[PDB]
Amino acid sequence: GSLTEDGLSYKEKFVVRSYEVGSNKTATVETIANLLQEVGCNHAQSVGFSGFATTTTMRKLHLIWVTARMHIEIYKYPAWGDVVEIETWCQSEGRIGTRRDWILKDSVTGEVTGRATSKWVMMNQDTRRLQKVSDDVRDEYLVFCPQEPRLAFPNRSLKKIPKLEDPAQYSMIGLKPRRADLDMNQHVNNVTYIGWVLESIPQEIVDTHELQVITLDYRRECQQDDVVDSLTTTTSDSQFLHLLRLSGDGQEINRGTTLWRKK
Amino acid sequence: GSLTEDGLSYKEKFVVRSYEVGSNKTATVETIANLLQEVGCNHAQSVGFSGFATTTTMRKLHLIWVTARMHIEIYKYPAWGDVVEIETWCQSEGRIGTRRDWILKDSVTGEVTGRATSKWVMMNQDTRRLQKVSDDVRDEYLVFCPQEPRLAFPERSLKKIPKLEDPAQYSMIGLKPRRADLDMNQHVNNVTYIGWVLESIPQEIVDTHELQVITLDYRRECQQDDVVDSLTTTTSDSQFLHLLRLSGDGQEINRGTTLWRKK
């Protein structure tokens, strides 16, 4: 992949692999999310970011970016062997945090097949205390980001998500991460949570519908030795409300919604 | 990737991705095994194989190949961003079954960084009854395979593995597959079992040693709604003996050995 001409966005092509596809022989939403993260990492590397994707001031102040929200809309999942092109870029959102956006295209047709957006907040790596973005970090972002707004979603991606009320309609309990679920820093990979959310969807919905939209808020991390319960209730196209919580004390780790279209 | 000049082997290049690496920023053994399976699938496609990698006679008789044994030796794990080249080929082993072999090379240096071999047996897809290879299937293999022997392991990969005796030294219990662990035909992916075996290795071994060799026998499949326990005992470099069994009735799924070298 490489930076675009203006140096303000990044593009990369991927061939969908055999083990990356589900029962209709197209990429799973987890494969898609992994690809989004890979192209994000390649972008950060190309513009001079560090394990973590920090800036110089951030390293000085022991700060990291963490994900607050991920929103993905897929119009067409690429088939096994197909080539997908992904374009990504970032923007600062003042003192609130930053945003990374993606567009997915079929590289044969050049048609948009999906779009995604994510919100990131600043966190002290040791205390794990959330903070506002300092003036000096905003200045570093400015040089690698478009100055005028550029939005993948010009709005479902901004909607408030409510907390599922007991009892849930469906559940999958006793979920735990294995080593393949961890990143190089031994944190649970953000895409694992997407998989866990989807585990409490009935196989029948999955057999008969395609996922069109997922929105996931990230409230707290699952540790390597934690155990998670995944809860879902129908709110309807079918729509669902989702909650991930620690199996023991019921501490919330994520909430989300999904929207599914009949095939 | 493509077939080599003679049409009797297949080569493919892969760039190691951000989410494919573990704590020392090199590819996990599970990433390696996934890449082995991907290049195997690309080879099969290129020589006219069909979901399943069946031949024409196999489909006619409702037969499939299943894995009986996987053996991997790694000398050097490729780093994040490195390019690895993998060469693969198959051979018939008379009426016993077939073999697929792989060689892994650094594409910058051309050095061999790893080797693998796998044994496959014929199975009736409906009855799940194992069978010998028929004369007409041997005939189909012969046109795509080298005629003279070509072994990734000329002269450990053939050693008999004993059954771990209770009590195990170490254990990880209540493992279950999620949708990301299933292949396009909804069977548990062969690489999942590797991950499950490794889960009962202590984190300290993993922190201080590199996995050099893994040998895994495949006795029976884990179904999508099964639960697995992973058992390990030190037999020693450190060596371990491994058993995967169904959590309930204790039915054996897999047995194996690993060999580890201090860093």
XYZ file of C-alpha atoms in Angstrom:
526
model
C 0.000 0.000 0.000
C 1.048 3.626 0.040
C 0.120 7.206 0.830
C -1.958 9.002 -1.815
C -0.465 11.811 -3.891
C -1.247 14.551 -1.313
C 0.155 12.429 1.575
C -3.108 12.923 3.562
C -4.607 9.388 3.142
C -3.425 5.794 2.683
C -4.530 3.004 0.339
C -3.936 -0.760 0.398
C -5.196 -3.791 -1.522
C -5.971 -7.187 0.010
C -6.838 -10.534 -1.500
C -9.502 -12.305 0.591
C -8.066 -15.592 2.002
C -9.666 -19.062 2.302
C -9.814 -19.041 6.135
C -11.149 -15.420 6.155
C -14.583 -16.285 4.718
C -17.816 -17.629 6.207
C -20.502 -20.001 4.959
C -21.503 -17.964 1.864
C -17.824 -17.747 0.798
C -17.504 -14.001 1.505
C -15.350 -12.203 4.095
C -16.707 -12.128 7.666
C -17.172 -8.780 9.376
C -14.278 -9.768 11.642
C -12.005 -10.250 8.604
C -13.129 -6.804 7.424
C -12.374 -5.265 10.831
C -8.905 -6.892 10.902
C -8.196 -5.423 7.431
C -9.293 -1.965 8.679
C -6.864 -2.284 11.564
C -4.009 -3.490 9.330
C -4.378 -0.532 6.921
C -4.605 1.839 9.915
C -1.294 0.430 11.214
C 0.371 0.734 7.786
C -0.797 4.385 7.557
C 0.652 5.176 11.029
C 3.966 3.521 10.082
C 4.167 5.488 6.825
C 3.758 8.878 8.513
C 6.305 8.150 11.263
C 4.331 6.742 14.245
C 6.007 4.248 16.636
C 4.123 -1.348 19.526
C 1.548 1.423 20.017
C 0.827 4.094 17.417
C 1.924 7.038 19.574
C 3.490 10.413 18.764
C 6.667 11.818 20.392
C 4.798 14.036 22.858
C 2.550 11.080 23.725
C 5.526 8.850 24.539
C 6.970 11.685 26.632
C 3.716 11.956 28.632
C 3.035 8.152 28.690
C -0.170 8.592 26.664
C -1.860 6.140 24.263
C -4.939 6.224 22.001
C -7.752 3.796 22.846
C -10.889 3.018 20.821
C -14.163 4.496 22.105
C -16.441 3.526 19.199
C -16.311 1.496 15.980
C -19.023 1.786 13.298
C -19.017 -0.343 10.124
C -21.514 -0.425 7.227
C -21.117 -3.105 4.551
C -23.020 -3.023 1.234
C -21.255 -6.043 -0.281
C -18.848 -8.502 1.387
C -15.916 -9.422 -0.944
C -15.723 -13.046 -2.106
C -12.891 -15.486 -1.467
C -10.115 -14.587 -3.957
C -11.515 -11.078 -4.623
C -9.331 -7.971 -4.290
C -10.612 -5.188 -2.026
C -9.095 -1.694 -1.857
C -9.244 0.197 1.431
C -8.561 3.919 1.866
C -8.110 5.422 5.327
C -7.399 8.787 6.895
C -7.558 10.483 10.304
C -8.882 13.792 11.607
C -8.569 15.555 14.972
C -11.835 16.400 16.737
C -10.519 19.286 18.834
C -9.887 18.293 22.434
C -12.378 15.397 22.426
C -10.154 12.887 20.598
C -9.404 11.779 17.039
C -11.281 9.877 14.326
C -10.084 7.294 11.804
C -12.279 6.704 8.745
C -12.175 4.039 5.999
C -13.738 3.432 2.574
C -13.842 -0.066 1.029
C -13.961 -0.541 -2.756
C -14.067 -3.434 -5.203
C -10.824 -2.926 -7.058
C -12.194 -4.496 -10.290
C -15.276 -2.207 -10.381
C -14.041 0.691 -8.185
C -17.482 0.656 -6.490
C -17.780 1.473 -2.762
C -18.691 -1.767 -0.950
C -18.373 -0.491 2.632
C -17.467 2.371 4.953
C -16.295 2.634 8.547
C -15.500 5.192 11.215
C -13.886 5.022 14.670
C -13.477 7.419 17.600
C -10.352 7.354 19.751
C -9.672 8.950 23.135
C -6.429 9.767 24.934
C -5.550 7.650 27.982
C -2.654 7.664 30.476
C -1.122 4.242 29.909
C -0.274 3.652 33.606
C -3.232 5.168 35.511
C -5.623 4.272 32.641
C -7.224 7.733 33.194
C -8.876 9.323 30.150
C -7.729 12.831 29.213
C -8.337 15.634 26.716
C -6.070 16.108 23.689
C -3.299 18.651 24.380
C -2.394 21.510 22.027
C 0.917 19.811 21.129
C -0.727 16.543 20.043
C -3.275 18.417 17.915
C -0.351 20.099 16.124
C 1.291 16.746 15.287
C -1.990 15.413 13.827
C -2.551 18.511 11.751
C 0.394 17.747 9.452
C -0.889 14.251 8.463
C -4.671 14.963 8.385
C -6.905 16.834 5.833
C -7.588 20.343 7.151
C -11.137 20.560 5.781
C -13.649 17.943 7.046
C -13.661 14.584 5.238
C -16.228 12.154 6.616
C -16.928 8.570 5.612
C -20.433 9.222 7.032
C -21.626 12.697 5.937
C -26.414 9.786 11.154
C -26.439 6.175 12.486
C -22.702 6.309 13.295
C -23.384 8.994 15.956
C -26.478 7.498 17.635
C -26.587 6.956 21.419
C -26.803 3.270 22.410
C -28.940 2.294 25.457
C -28.116 -0.384 28.024
C -29.781 -3.773 27.548
C -32.139 -4.659 30.426
C -32.200 -8.096 32.069
C -33.464 -10.515 31.033
C -31.778 -10.722 27.590
C -33.561 -12.533 24.794
C -30.414 -14.492 23.828
C -27.028 -15.135 25.418
C -23.672 -16.848 25.063
C -21.878 -17.192 28.394
C -18.393 -18.069 29.591
C -16.463 -16.534 26.629
C -12.745 -16.186 27.227
C -9.775 -14.987 25.141
C -7.032 -17.320 23.914
C -3.534 -16.212 22.913
C -4.652 -15.711 19.267
C -7.111 -13.058 20.595
C -4.275 -10.883 22.006
C -2.249 -8.198 20.183
C 1.557 -7.879 20.361
C 1.166 -5.918 23.636
C -0.975 -8.720 25.169
C -4.201 -6.683 25.196
C -7.346 -8.289 23.779
C -7.629 -7.309 20.107
C -10.515 -4.882 19.420
C -11.897 -7.263 16.756
C -12.359 -10.070 19.375
C -15.126 -7.982 21.002
C -16.976 -7.845 17.676
C -16.821 -11.643 17.506
C -18.077 -11.956 21.074
C -21.024 -9.588 20.402
C -22.022 -11.659 17.363
C -21.889 -14.941 19.323
C -25.278 -14.275 20.958
C -27.003 -13.797 17.571
C -28.960 -16.987 16.687
C -27.408 -19.134 13.936
C -30.767 -18.773 12.103
C -30.411 -15.016 11.730
C -26.872 -15.576 10.455
C -28.045 -18.308 8.048
C -30.828 -16.098 6.588
C -29.539 -12.527 6.884
C -26.469 -10.465 6.108
C -25.081 -7.996 8.623
C -25.363 -4.494 7.153
C -24.406 -2.256 10.095
C -22.624 -2.703 13.430
C -21.987 0.006 16.040
C -19.865 -0.889 19.072
C -18.984 1.276 22.105
C -15.894 0.228 24.089
C -16.272 1.021 27.801
C -13.523 -1.008 29.483
C -11.025 -3.668 28.410
C -11.349 -7.408 28.934
C -8.148 -8.685 30.593
C -6.446 -11.884 29.456
C -7.805 -13.760 32.503
C -11.394 -12.366 32.355
C -14.562 -14.193 31.322
C -17.327 -12.490 29.352
C -21.048 -12.947 28.783
C -22.612 -11.744 25.529
C -26.258 -10.647 25.673
C -28.634 -9.743 22.806
C -32.299 -8.620 22.510
C -34.282 -8.047 19.273
C -35.366 -4.374 18.973
C -37.051 -4.749 15.568
C -34.596 -5.761 8.460
C -33.833 -7.130 11.929
C -32.159 -5.024 14.608
C -30.541 -6.104 17.868
C -29.245 -4.484 21.017
C -26.057 -5.932 22.518
C -24.205 -5.971 25.828
C -20.873 -7.576 26.815
C -20.256 -7.799 30.558
C -17.835 -9.632 32.829
C -19.254 -13.073 33.774
C -18.709 -12.547 37.475
C -19.578 -9.098 38.731
C -21.531 -8.029 35.606
C -19.229 -5.025 34.881
C -20.047 -3.613 31.419
C -17.244 -3.879 28.861
C -19.137 -3.017 25.598
C -22.555 -2.105 24.221
C -23.705 -2.059 20.600
C -26.380 -2.490 17.910
C -26.508 -4.474 14.694
C -28.777 -4.235 11.679
C -29.411 -7.223 9.429
C -31.039 -7.485 5.948
C -32.782 -10.661 4.741
C -30.897 -12.286 1.821
C 1.241 -16.995 -6.149
C 1.692 -19.443 -9.001
C 2.751 -22.931 -10.038
C 6.506 -23.359 -10.568
C 7.918 -23.979 -14.057
C 7.344 -27.783 -14.058
C 3.760 -27.372 -12.732
C 4.430 -29.800 -9.829
C 4.688 -27.256 -6.949
C 3.203 -23.884 -5.961
C 4.797 -20.756 -4.469
C 3.257 -17.720 -2.734
C 4.566 -14.659 -0.904
C 2.959 -13.167 2.217
C 3.634 -9.966 4.127
C 3.229 -10.546 7.887
C 0.365 -8.368 9.274
C 0.103 -6.345 12.517
C -2.531 -8.616 14.124
C -0.651 -11.812 13.068
C 2.291 -11.322 15.468
C 2.767 -12.051 19.177
C 4.702 -10.366 21.968
C 8.131 -10.461 20.263
C 6.665 -8.934 17.068
C 7.093 -12.130 15.013
C 4.390 -14.329 13.477
C 2.655 -16.809 15.793
C 2.704 -20.491 14.927
C -1.044 -20.177 14.302
C -0.392 -17.431 11.708
C 2.179 -19.752 10.101
C -0.317 -22.634 10.028
C -3.004 -20.380 8.501
C -0.542 -19.349 5.744
C 0.289 -23.047 5.107
C -3.410 -23.749 4.666
C -3.961 -20.713 2.413
C -1.124 -21.670 0.007
C -2.420 -25.280 0.003
C -5.848 -23.975 -1.062
C -4.303 -21.777 -3.787
C -2.351 -24.799 -5.136
C -5.527 -26.938 -5.223
C -7.422 -24.160 -7.072
C -4.640 -23.750 -9.628
C -4.600 -27.447 -10.588
C -8.394 -27.808 -10.965
C -9.660 -28.900 -7.489
C -13.145 -27.696 -6.447
C -15.671 -25.713 -0.828
C -13.704 -28.934 -0.329
C -10.543 -29.707 -2.281
C -12.020 -32.858 -3.821
C -11.271 -34.515 -7.165
C -13.964 -35.598 -9.671
C -14.068 -39.232 -8.521
C -14.165 -38.139 -4.859
C -17.271 -36.006 -5.374
C -18.838 -38.928 -7.253
C -18.215 -41.271 -4.273
C -18.910 -38.542 -1.641
C -15.321 -38.675 -0.355
C -13.235 -35.928 1.309
C -9.636 -35.613 2.584
C -9.208 -35.039 6.308
C -5.995 -34.232 8.199
C -4.472 -37.046 10.267
C -1.225 -35.330 11.302
C 0.412 -31.898 11.076
C 4.129 -31.385 11.840
C 5.796 -27.939 11.754
C 9.432 -26.961 12.451
C 10.347 -23.276 12.640
C 13.950 -22.036 12.669
C 13.043 -18.333 12.516
C 9.604 -16.674 12.825
C 9.212 -13.777 10.302
C 8.839 -10.287 11.782
C 5.906 -7.919 11.336
C 6.218 -6.435 7.805
C 8.634 -9.143 6.577
C 7.917 -11.083 3.376
C 7.888 -14.887 3.614
C 7.850 -17.238 0.615
C 6.126 -20.598 0.964
C 6.507 -23.527 -1.445
C 4.097 -26.483 -1.280
C 3.502 -29.760 -3.087
C 1.671 -33.056 -2.591
C 2.506 -36.734 -2.985
C 0.443 -39.918 -2.878
C 1.445 -42.517 -0.284
C -0.076 -45.512 -2.083
C -3.352 -46.582 -0.515
C -2.614 -45.103 2.947
C -3.391 -41.479 2.060
C -1.668 -38.385 0.684
C 0.897 -35.918 2.031
C 1.248 -32.164 1.609
C 4.662 -30.628 2.340
C 5.782 -26.991 2.705
C 9.079 -25.054 2.825
C 9.218 -21.520 4.281
C 11.895 -19.066 3.141
C 12.853 -15.479 3.895
C 12.259 -13.814 0.550
C 15.039 -11.234 1.170
C 17.778 -13.807 2.004
C 16.284 -16.946 0.385
C 17.167 -18.868 3.592
C 14.877 -21.713 4.741
C 13.231 -20.504 7.958
C 10.809 -23.423 8.372
C 9.443 -26.737 7.087
C 6.136 -28.579 7.475
C 4.445 -31.814 6.518
C 0.898 -33.157 6.817
C -0.803 -36.527 6.332
C -4.321 -36.787 4.940
C -6.723 -39.745 4.895
C -9.806 -40.466 2.807
C -13.194 -40.313 4.537
C -16.796 -40.868 3.451
C -18.369 -37.454 4.061
C -21.731 -38.935 5.135
C -20.760 -41.953 7.272
C -17.480 -40.345 8.418
C -15.897 -43.802 7.809
C -12.186 -43.808 6.902
C -11.228 -45.549 3.649
C -8.179 -46.522 1.583
C -7.243 -44.478 -1.512
C -8.757 -45.992 -4.665
C -6.734 -46.648 -7.818
C -8.597 -43.883 -9.730
C -7.788 -41.238 -7.100
C -4.104 -42.217 -7.128
C -4.272 -41.715 -10.921
C -5.616 -38.148 -10.576
C -2.913 -37.197 -8.025
C -0.098 -38.501 -10.164
C -0.490 -35.777 -12.807
C -0.069 -32.940 -10.236
C 2.575 -34.560 -7.971
C 6.364 -35.198 -8.409
C 6.880 -38.852 -9.348
C 10.149 -39.338 -7.473
C 10.024 -38.735 -3.688
C 10.350 -35.128 -2.512
C 10.275 -34.776 1.270
C 10.383 -31.667 3.416
C 11.735 -34.004 6.138
C 14.291 -36.396 4.548
C 15.366 -38.944 7.170
C 10.628 -36.520 14.388
C 7.760 -35.984 11.932
C 6.983 -39.737 11.978
C 7.407 -40.469 15.715
C 4.539 -42.187 17.572
C 2.871 -39.972 20.204
C 1.727 -41.577 23.509
C -1.439 -40.772 25.453
C -1.062 -38.368 28.363
C -1.946 -40.016 31.704
C -4.102 -38.279 34.339
C -3.269 -36.208 36.250
C -1.885 -33.597 33.795
C 0.717 -31.152 35.018
C -1.141 -28.194 33.422
C -4.628 -27.610 31.987
C -6.936 -25.089 30.355
C -10.553 -26.185 30.589
C -13.877 -25.223 29.034
C -12.487 -24.115 25.615
C -15.151 -23.622 22.971
C -15.113 -22.478 19.328
C -16.671 -19.191 18.182
C -17.779 -18.439 14.613
C -14.303 -17.090 13.722
C -12.940 -20.606 14.477
C -15.106 -22.263 11.786
C -14.237 -22.712 8.088
C -16.631 -21.926 5.213
C -18.267 -25.372 5.657
C -18.840 -24.760 9.409
C -16.222 -27.268 10.615
C -13.682 -26.128 13.222
C -10.556 -24.885 11.415
C -7.578 -27.251 11.839
C -5.486 -24.325 13.166
C -7.917 -23.749 16.103
C -6.740 -27.086 17.549
C -3.146 -25.869 17.497
C -4.197 -22.806 19.488
C -6.106 -24.964 21.974
C -3.077 -27.259 22.490
C -0.876 -24.231 23.213
C -3.335 -22.754 25.744
C -2.204 -25.165 28.466
C 1.462 -24.176 28.103
C 2.404 -21.816 30.978
C 2.776 -18.152 30.003
C 6.325 -18.311 31.471
C 7.497 -20.887 28.961
C 6.009 -18.731 26.207
C 7.714 -15.615 27.620
C 11.178 -17.296 27.814
C 11.162 -19.853 24.988
C 10.442 -20.131 21.289
C 8.429 -23.018 19.905
C 10.688 -24.950 17.544
C 8.631 -28.069 16.741
C 4.968 -29.060 17.009
C 3.490 -32.450 16.058
C -0.272 -32.866 16.244
C -2.396 -35.978 15.551
C -6.086 -35.415 14.714
C -8.296 -38.227 16.022
C -11.835 -36.815 15.816
C -13.403 -33.419 15.074
C -14.643 -30.927 17.659
C -18.227 -29.987 16.698
C -19.442 -26.389 16.843
C -21.306 -26.977 20.143
C -18.590 -29.073 21.871
C -16.370 -27.980 24.767
C -12.712 -28.989 25.033
C -10.116 -29.397 27.753
C -6.419 -28.941 26.943
C -3.920 -30.953 28.997
C -0.095 -30.727 29.066
C 2.745 -32.529 30.929
C 6.479 -31.729 30.769
C 8.421 -34.722 29.345
C 11.823 -32.995 29.493
C 15.158 -27.405 25.420
C 11.776 -28.110 27.040
C 9.410 -30.756 25.690
C 5.724 -31.335 26.441
C 3.114 -33.982 25.779
C -0.381 -32.747 24.907
C -3.953 -34.040 24.926
C -7.232 -32.404 23.774
C -10.375 -34.168 24.953
C -14.086 -33.346 25.117
C -14.875 -31.654 28.475
C -17.757 -33.970 29.284
C -17.078 -37.594 28.452
C -13.284 -37.224 28.017
C -13.324 -38.443 24.363
C -9.890 -37.830 22.766
C -9.841 -35.182 19.982
C -6.069 -34.700 19.475
C -2.704 -35.642 20.926
C 0.647 -33.956 20.303
C 4.159 -32.896 21.371
C 5.956 -29.561 21.340
C 9.641 -28.756 21.646
C 10.792 -25.370 22.926
C 14.202 -23.644 22.919
C 15.245 -21.012 25.471
C 15.660 -17.537 23.885
